[PDB]
């Protein structure tokens, strides 16, 4: 489980975790509470998996977009700041940690990608994506290349995709229509197409990932890269003289980065909820705290109004905010992970040539708009079905297809719930399994239990719904 | 298979099949072609099952509503009458055998249910359903009952259900919205409710079926029944003095029978298509022909204008047409069978008390609006998927998760088709099986075949679609 007394903190390996450990120590010098800071791999995946059972860190750091999922799963303890404190952080940033009218994490900083150029290799950076092929040609001559960024992650290639019309889920009347996915429209295609063409023409390489691009840029091998504030430190170390400017335009429109807001959320299974709140509110979210971290690795435009008033002077932050405004805040809904995985795949297959732009995006659209089982299960309230089945058993203890020689002398609300598993039978099964589990202990007899299994088994048919071929009800 | 030279005809056991055999003989006396007339059980089920392989009758008789399904399955040969002939039959009736802008059967007669009363027991039949409980009470005293009709079939109980708002599929802009099902609205509930209440109060019995009601009425045991023209003969035999009148009203509206049009369709696998056409056009659809049949058992309002001009004089036919007009023509779409099965179930469970009106209807709505696998398969054009997979194999004969040490140095349109099986995985499987079958013969090698199976197997995943847990590709 989770030790009471200490604070364990998870944050991604590309963030200023050393800078955060310092705030960990200042907090310890004043508190005596041991603050541990870790940067595991795939922590945004691991957390859902571990916080579920009741383990993991007290605090979890990631971009706001994943927290909706965590919330829906009941993994995040709600956070509640006295009005005053809230007045210190930008409205904009508070919204990003708001799910179902609740605050589920603490905002830290606003992130957005910008175009980063080597002032040596390229005094004047291009205004347009279209300009780039010419450049690379020119640069290849001098033994260099025009541009290199991470292609393995959608986050990076999305600003171009989004430029001429691409979007994730439309925002219709105060909500996201997760059936209205715009990754397969003219714009998205145009964008991804241009991207692939760059590859087809030897201007960049489908296999290029983060570290490869970072190294290339930091060793002065390519004129341009695309990245976020976090990456500024390593360059500051690298002897390269760099500028940070607005991303190029495509078909005349600005690239539109998915703006994300670094957030800190408290494990809803942690004993140290108070300590956590005090840490984040009184130490991290302070001018010294943020600075300590921002020193290790730049946060972008911090959530706290006072320190940002300082940071704003930095031209790099200006360009960061410029790109951010051209962009859109990522949604934080549960379906976002689906969307991301979907697009990650499309981009890769298209980039690698396994598929065509039109095909890959078409698959992404289909898949990103498909509801996942785990989500549906969490949202399910299966009690009505439980109650129904129990009752039905009493009325069959003395009254077609009878169970025993003795049988041979709520339903709506339940079915309403099961309706949600009508398009995924494996899922329908899981829902039945969940029902079983939630009752096995309340089942006295055994005639009782198996006369429950069989009833449970043809429950979907009773609702006029589709049913699994097989379904183990251990 | 089907013998060339003879004509085999299927018609339901409750129709004037003897009367039709006569036209069978007059046709034989003039032709020498042996005409066989049979009335098998569940012939509307058997036919789809047998006509599929290429057997069955040359001609198939049923209400128009089932023929849409037969058509979609390619079981019905299109029928084409010279304008003149068509001018002999009512427009209304031609529409009923029209599917996808094609004539798929020959209209014979218009059917509709009416209220049939014993003039001895009840000189003045009720205007309203509401009046009936009082009657039955009064009649039970005299040792009789007010009303008895078939409860095992939805066809009979639907006029009441439909009365105050019930419908099958809404007709939206020239088409039926099979997702807009009106069997679970206030009206339908009201209607079914009244019906169940009749039962709950000992006014009728949930177990009452056709023969039980017919016998009861024909032996003068109940004052009223609800039935169609076909039933007139047996009563004519029965010494009971009966009238045929408009069905009672419910909540102030007329009962609304599903008007059906007896149709004759030609097996699209029969060699005798010409004979069939000549039989139906030149013998059956004539004043003598129809009469011969109408003699055995009344057809209702026949499709042929001339004979109906005669029949119209019969007050019984008048009442039949009155009820028909208060009613609605059944749709002939493939989904109709689903709808009927769904409602048959609801009615029975509600009537039997296994479920409540609200629950049962709610299940019917859900289920009647659910697309069936066989339908989706028929409508599927899986070629694109076939072509795609074949090609993909060539491009893998020398180029992640490789098949052989050698591999280790259309898609959209296809997926568009597979999208249709996204809510039924068993079905997705069948679609893959169909693809396999349609290629096993075109597959030279064996490395070829199994390198096809594996590709085929993760085809849904390539389309971002859901996939079966298991799928045998024999
Ligand atoms: O590619 C598959 C992948 O998608 C998911 O990651 C996304 C995040 O949810 C999202 O916040 C963003 O990640 C970036 C941050 O905003 C930023 O601080 C910095 O770390 O760069 C990040 C990108 O590498 O975008 C990504 C998608 O690219 C998802 O959460 C994962 O589970 C998954 O493996
Ligand atoms: O109840 C289950 C059942 O539904 C289907 O039968 C329907 C028919 O499609 C339909 O034409 C109608 O059947 C009647 C005729 O119109 C009439 O000529 C006479 O025969 O009375 C009939 C009713 O018994 O209504 C029924 C539904 O009640 C379906 O086709 C069957 O497969 C099925 O078993
Ligand atoms: Cl690790
Ligand atoms: Cl909480
Ligand atoms: Cl307060
Ligand atoms: Cl969006
Ligand atoms: Cl478009
Ligand atoms: Cl038989
Ligand atoms: Cl044909
Ligand atoms: Cl003609
Ligand atoms: Cl209708
Ligand atoms: Cl309603």
At A255, list the tokens: 């690239």
Q: In what order do the strands lie in the sheet with B114-118?
A: B145-147, B222-227, B114-118, B242-245
Ligand nearest to the CA of B12: 2
Question: What is the C-alpha to C-alpha distance for residues B186 and B365, in angstroms, rounded to an integer?
Answer: 13
Per-position DSSP letters for B449-466, written without gaps between them: HHHHHHHHHTHHHHTT--
Protein residue with its CA nearest to atom 33 in ligand 2: B341
Side-chain-side CA neighbours of A437 within 13 Å: the count stands at: 8
Answer whether A469's CB lies under 8 Å from A432's CB: no
At B422, list the tokens: 């996204």
The alpha carbon of A13 and the centre of ligand 3 are apart by a number of angstroms equal to 10
Asked if B367 and A462 come within 8 Å (Cβ–Cβ), the reply is no
Question: What is the C-alpha to C-alpha distance for residues A286 and A282, in angstroms, rounded to an integer?
Answer: 7
Which residue from B minimizes the CA distance to A362?
B412
At A172, list the tokens: 């219709």
* C-alpha distances in Å from residue B382, one per residue of A23, B52, B440: 62, 20, 14
Elucidation method: X-ray
A415 interaction partners in chain B (CB closer than 8 Å): 359, 362-363, 366
Resolution of the experimental structure, in angstroms: 2.7
Q: Which residues pair with A265 in a beta bridge?
A: A60
Least Cα separation, residue B8 to chain A (angstroms): 38
Question: What is the C-alpha to C-alpha distance for residues B196 and B208, in angstroms, rounded to an integer?
Answer: 13
- Is position A64 annotated in a ligand binding site? no
At B332, list the tokens: 């002939």
At A359, list the tokens: 């095909």
Cβ atoms within 10 Å, residue A143: 7
* C-alpha distances in Å from residue B68, one per residue of B98, B110, B263, B277: 9, 17, 12, 19
Asked if B469 and A465 come within 8 Å (Cβ–Cβ), the reply is no
List the single best residue of B359, B410, B467 to mutate versus A (max A Cβ within 10 A).
B359
Query: What's the burial of A80, exposed, middle or buried (CB within 10 Å: 0-12/13-18/19+)?
Result: exposed
Question: What is the C-alpha to C-alpha distance for residues B16 and B6, in angstroms, rounded to an integer?
Answer: 21
Protein residue with its CA nearest to atom 18 in ligand 2: B63
Q: For tokens 């940033």, name the residue.
A: A93
Interface contact A419, partner B, CB < 8 A: yes
Asked if A426 and B422 come within 8 Å (Cβ–Cβ), the reply is no
* Most distant CA atoms of chain A, gap in Å: 95
Question: What is the C-alpha to C-alpha distance for residues A311 and A92, in angstroms, rounded to an integer?
Answer: 17
Nearest Cβ partner for B464 among A367, A463, A470? A367
- Breaks in chain A after residues, C-to-N cutoff 2.5 Å: 399, 409
At A40, list the tokens: 């595991």
Query: What's the burial of B161, exposed, middle or buried (CB within 10 Å: 0-12/13-18/19+)?
Result: buried
CA A216 to chain centre: 28
* Pocket test residue of A11, A97, A112, A155 for ligand 1, highest count of atoms within 8 A of CB: A155
Question: What is the C-alpha to C-alpha distance for residues B216 and A275, in angstroms, rounded to an integer?
Answer: 82
Protein residue with its CA nearest to atom 4 in ligand 1: A340
Backbone angles phi, psi at B61, to 5 degrees: -105, 125
Answer whether A167's CB lies under 8 Å from A257's CB: no
For residue A304, what is the DSSP state?
A: B
Backbone angles phi, psi at B115, to 5 degrees: -90, 125
For residue B8, what is the DSSP state?
A: E
Answer whether B284's CB lies under 8 Å from B303's CB: no
- Breaks in chain B after residues, C-to-N cutoff 2.5 Å: 399, 409
Nearest CA among B198, B252, B213, B230 for reference residue B11: B230
Distance between start and end Cα atoms, chain A: 27
Answer whether B146's CB lies under 8 Å from B222's CB: yes
Side-chain-side CA neighbours of A467 within 13 Å: the count stands at: 16
* Pocket test residue of B46, B340, B342, B344 for ligand 2, highest count of atoms within 8 A of CB: B340
The alpha carbon of A59 and the centre of ligand 3 are apart by a number of angstroms equal to 17
Question: What is the C-alpha to C-alpha distance for residues B16 and B279, in angstroms, rounded to an integer?
Answer: 17
For residue B407, what is the DSSP state?
A: S
Q: Is B45 in the pocket of ligand 2 (CB under 6 A)?
A: yes
Nearest Cβ partner for A466 among B358, B370, B416? B370
Least Cα separation, residue A418 to chain B (angstroms): 11
Nearest Cβ partner for B464 among A366, A423, A464? A366
- Contacts for B318 with CB less than 8 Å, ≥ 6 apart: B312
Answer whether A160's CB lies under 8 Å from A350's CB: no
Asked if A423 and B423 come within 8 Å (Cβ–Cβ), the reply is yes
Interface contact A412, partner B, CB < 8 A: yes
Answer whether B109's CB lies under 8 Å from B302's CB: yes
Side-chain-side CA neighbours of B357 within 13 Å: the count stands at: 18
Question: What is the C-alpha to C-alpha distance for residues A165 and B157, in angstroms, rounded to an integer?
Answer: 54
Nearest CA among B275, B364, B370 for reference residue B33: B275
Q: For tokens 């096809």, name the residue.
A: B452
Nearest Cβ partner for A465 among B366, B462, B464? B366
CA A458 to chain centre: 37
At B286, list the tokens: 């004539």
Contacts 24+ apart (CB under 8 A), B445-449: B447/B404, B448/B393
Nearest CA among B299, B339, B356 for reference residue B158: B339
Q: Is A260 in the pocket of ligand 1 (CB under 6 A)?
A: yes
At A45, list the tokens: 């995946």
Going from N- to C-terminal start, the domains of chain A cover 1-370, 371-474
Instruction: Determine which helix (DSSP H) or strand (DSSP E) holds A195, and give its type and residue range.
Output: helix A186-200
- Contacts for B78 with CB less than 8 Å, ≥ 6 apart: B102, B103, B104
Side-chain-side CA neighbours of A453 within 13 Å: the count stands at: 10
Per-position DSSP letters for B280-333, written without gaps between them: IIIIITSHHHHHHHHHHS--SEESBHHHHHHHTTSHHHHHHHHHHHHSEEPP-S
- Contacts for A440 with CB less than 8 Å, ≥ 6 apart: A449
Pairing status of strand B253-254 against strand B249-250: antiparallel
Backbone angles phi, psi at A297, to 5 degrees: -155, 120
Side-chain-side CA neighbours of A105 within 13 Å: the count stands at: 31
Instruction: Determine which helix (DSSP H) or strand (DSSP E) holds B278, and give its type and residue range.
Output: helix B273-279
Question: What is the C-alpha to C-alpha distance for residues A367 and A360, in angstroms, rounded to an integer?
Answer: 11
E-assigned strands of B94-164?
Answer: 98-99, 102-103, 106-111, 114-118, 145-147
List the single best residue of B388, B429, B461, B464 to mutate versus A (max A Cβ within 10 A).
B464
Asked if A464 and B367 come within 8 Å (Cβ–Cβ), the reply is yes
B415 interaction partners in chain A (CB closer than 8 Å): 359, 362-363, 366
Question: What is the C-alpha to C-alpha distance for residues B67 and A218, in angstroms, rounded to an integer?
Answer: 73
At A358, list the tokens: 């039109």
Question: What is the C-alpha to C-alpha distance for residues B8 and B35, in angstroms, rounded to an integer?
Answer: 6
Asked if A356 and B411 come within 8 Å (Cβ–Cβ), the reply is yes
């Amino acid at each position: 489980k989770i030790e009471e007394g200490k604070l364990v903190i998870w944050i991604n390996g590309d963030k200023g975790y050393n800078g955060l450990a310092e705030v960990g120590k200042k907090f310890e010098k004043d508190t005596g509470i041991k603050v541990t800071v870790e940067h595991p791999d795939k922590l945004e995946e691991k957390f859902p998996q571990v916080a579920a059972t009741g383990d993991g860190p007290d605090i979890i750091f990631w971009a706001h977009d994943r927290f909706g999922g965590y919330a829906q799963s009941g993994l995040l303890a709600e956070i509640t700041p006295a009005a005053a404190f809230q007045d210190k952080l930008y409205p904009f940033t508070w919204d990003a940690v708001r799910y179902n009218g609740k605050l589920i994490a603490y905002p830290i900083a606003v992130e957005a990608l910008s175009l980063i150029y080597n002032k040596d290799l390229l005094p004047n950076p291009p205004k347009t994506w279209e300009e780039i092929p010419a450049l690379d040609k020119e640069l290849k001559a001098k033994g260099k290349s025009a541009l290199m960024f991470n292609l393995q992650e959608p986050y990076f290639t999305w600003p171009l995709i989004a430029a001429d019309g691409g979007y994730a889920f439309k925002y219709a009347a105060g909500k996201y229509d997760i059936k209205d996915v715009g990754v397969d429209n003219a714009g998205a295609k145009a964008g991804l197409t241009f991207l692939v063409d760059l590859i087809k023409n030897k201007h960049m390489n489908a296999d290029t990932d983060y570290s490869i691009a970072e190294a290339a840029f930091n060793k002065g091998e390519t004129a341009m890269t695309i990245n976020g504030p976090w990456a500024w430190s390593n360059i500051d170390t690298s002897a390269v003289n760099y500028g940070v400017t607005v991303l190029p335009t495509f078909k005349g429109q600005p690239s539109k980065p998915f703006v994300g807001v670094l957030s800190a959320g408290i494990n809803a299974a942690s004993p140290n909820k108070e300590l956590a709140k005090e840490f984040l509110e009184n130490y991290l979210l302070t001018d010294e705290g943020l600075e300590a971290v921002n020193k290790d690795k730049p946060l972008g435009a911090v959530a706290l109004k006072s320190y940002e008033e300082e940071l704003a002077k930095d031209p790099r932050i200006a360009a960061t905010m410029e790109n951010a405004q051209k962009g859109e805040i990522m949604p934080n809904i549960p379906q976002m992970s689906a969307f991301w995985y979907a697009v990650r795949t499309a981009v890769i297959n298209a980039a690698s040539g396994r598929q065509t732009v039109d095909a890959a995006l078409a698959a992404a659209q289909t898949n990103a708009a498909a509801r996942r089982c785990q989500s549906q299960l969490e949202r399910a309230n299966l009690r009505p079905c439980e109650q129904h089945l129990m009752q039905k058993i009493q009325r069959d203890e003395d009254s077609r297809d009878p169970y025993s020689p003795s049988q041979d002398p709520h339903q709506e609300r339940c079915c309403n719930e099961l309706n949600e598993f009508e398009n995924n039978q494996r899922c329908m099964c899981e829902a039945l399994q969940q029902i079983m589990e939630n009752q096995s202990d309340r089942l006295q007899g055994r005639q009782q239990e198996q006369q429950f299994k069989r009833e449970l088994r043809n429950l979907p048919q009773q609702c006029g719904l589709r049913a699994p071929q097989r379904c183990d009800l251990d």
